[PDB]
Design a protein around this ligand. Structure first.
Ligand SMILES: [Cl-]
Length: 124
């Protein structure tokens, strides 16, 4: 599809190990947010991630409408506090960049880029 092919292209061209897109699961008022599309994923455990608004990497970006950058997960977060950003755990991400996706001044999704094994973030 359009989203999948765009996702694989940007991830490869930007020199990232992983990429994902989160959206609200449904139209329902108390709908959770979930990682819907992935590129460079090691497993399908990202599908176990259920985020309420304001929770996880996707929920935080969705709520604020502001990018989130973690240049070094090991320095920025305690190993125990990683459960608050579950994609970091299922995908063993060591650095992340998460940006809001906008449509007509409204955030509809979260685009995430991640590095593994201590590979630094390329220029943002
Ligand atoms: Cl997450």
């Amino acid at each position: 599809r359009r989203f999948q092919e765009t996702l694989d292209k940007i991830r490869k061209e930007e020199g990232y190990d992983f990429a994902a897109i989160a959206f609200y699961e449904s139209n329902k008022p108390s709908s959770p947010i979930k990682w819907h599309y992935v590129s460079g994923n090691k497993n399908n455990r990202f599908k176990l991630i259920i985020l309420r608004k304001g929770r996880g990497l996707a929920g935080t970006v969705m709520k604020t409408g502001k990018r989130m950058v973690i240049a070094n997960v090991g320095l920025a977060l305690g190993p125990e506090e990683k459960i608050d950003y579950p994609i970091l755990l299922s995908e063993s991400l060591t650095a992340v960049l998460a940006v809001p996706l906008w449509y007509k001044n409204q955030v509809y999704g979260v685009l995430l880029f991640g590095q593994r094994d201590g590979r630094p973030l390329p220029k943002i």
